[PDB]
């Protein structure tokens, strides 16, 4: 029993982290086959960062201007190209620790593990959701850029995130491994707005299922509701509208617990309308939306 | 910016996990040099578990009765010994992936990362505190025993925990790597009581410091207090009494933020006496006690 914000084991990603230095700027790179991926803003001086012309800045750089270091080992750069907001440095050496991997553009509401790195060395690992407004609630200091978010599927590492910047609200923004930002953000040191941040309804429901499975049942009420009725209440509280697809995804959890999704919806509506009255669910005094239905079933069936 | 429940990178511990099978029972083992460590209750049948005589049960077992598997690789067992509640299986092969390591008996209030495993394969990683009552609030299913808790100090893995059992309250109990239980627990399937579970005051203070550092300052009040006065209020709310040692440990955080420990104590007293009035601190609606002062300074200075 017990339910915990659980990260993927980080060993296969640790083996891909390198240090990328261009002039004074140092951040983390991802070393897969003979290509090192990092944020293109490694080429910026603190001045460039206010409104950089990446095209013009990159032209003053050649392969020898990119210092790539794995442990104490200095890699030889034999090619450089800019793809959106990612720099790809061709190196003479294929990473002998390259896991089986894919690049995936993850959907809002899905989760992933962040391996927070500095100077190409791992610091720690934590689970994040891609929020509806394409930000994450991370822990990132200077030097953390190039740190990556990933899922593991048995042997296959799926990289989905590369850390780039912190917004004025203190939340975090980054790119997929093709260098395309999640959300409307650009890699320049200007004030940038994430949209209103809405709660991931299907994830809140999964976590209430997770709680029921763990013997927290107090919030279970005598009521039911419909999607429209519930969605009226969802809109009021900035919850994402629930859909039959969301119901279908919860099916396994519904069928395991024997609690109809719309009954759980009625429970959530009363939680949302009355608060928790100083009570807690799975050791939290707020409704948690950073667990997917998959996250719940993995942790509850002991997937490795 | 940002503050997250962060686990250590798990790569060095992943390389030490093996599968130990005795008869039908399978759990995880830790493979360091030519010794595999696992819970001695691997030798129990479901019947034995109610009141096992480990001495008599172990005597019916020889080296060939211990099936040790690393990946698809079957290790040869050339020796077995019981040390408290741990079985040490001597194997013919030294683990070529053995990290630099120590066995440490960790203090209550200190934190560690758990690499949750099944069949010797990693499932995920999360941070736990050893509670004052020598239990942890984990996520552990059947097969999870042998899963270990550890800290990393640069190159050195410090193993402190090996998972053994879940108590009726749904919290978790285990041994150090010498097989000595944390707390009054024994490895038998009987009802066992952890003591009253008290809050780790020094950790709550570190986290309020963590919050101030992250721009959450609302709870900062105009009051101060003394240790005795504060400790009167601590006893009332089942907080561990605060000591000059605890103050000295917070010194760095106090000196960084410019907020006296006793002023922060006065803030905590009002939080404890008035609750949070529906407000949140670092995205929590409860006072968090599973961050040590070290945890806060590591995450805030980007230690790797
Ligand atoms: C990459 O290492 C860095 C990560 C920032 C630093 C502090 N917390 C983060 O997430 N990214 C940047 O510095 C980024 C570079 C621009 C070219 C996009 N700029 C940025 O994030 O500005 C906001 C900020 C900078 C420094 C401290 C706090 C916030
Ligand atoms: C080790 O794999 C297992 C871990 C339990 C299983 C479910 N959650 C856990 O932490 N440990 C035991 O099964 C342990 C063996 C005794 C000889 C100590 N017994 C135990 O934990 O009893 C409580 C329990 C058993 C099964 C399910 C739920 C609770």
Author numbering:
A (entry chain A), B (entry chain A): 1 to 304
Provide the authors' own sentences about this structure as they appear in the paper.
Mpro is a cysteine protease that mediates the cleavage of viral polyproteins during viral replication and is a high-profile antiviral drug target. The SARS-CoV-2 main protease (Mpro) is the drug target of Pfizer’s oral drug nirmatrelvir. The emergence of SARS-CoV-2 variants with mutations in Mpro raised the alarm of potential drug resistance. The X-ray crystal structures of the representative Mpro mutants S144A, S144L, M165Y, E166Q, H172Y, and Q192T with and/or without GC-376/nirmatrelvir provide a structural explanation for the drug resistance.
The structures of H164N (apo and GC-376 bound) and E166Q (apo) were also determined for comparison. H164N is a high-frequency mutation with 4682 occurrences and remained sensitive to all three inhibitors (<4.1-fold change in Ki). The catalytic activity of the H164N mutant (4.2-fold lower in kcat/Km) is comparable to that of the WT. GC-376 is a veterinary drug candidate for treating cats’ feline infectious peritonitis virus (FIPV) infection. GC-376 and nirmatrelvir place the same pyrrolidone group in the S1 pocket. S144, H164, E166, H172, and N142 mutants impact the size and hydrophobicity of the S1 binding pocket.
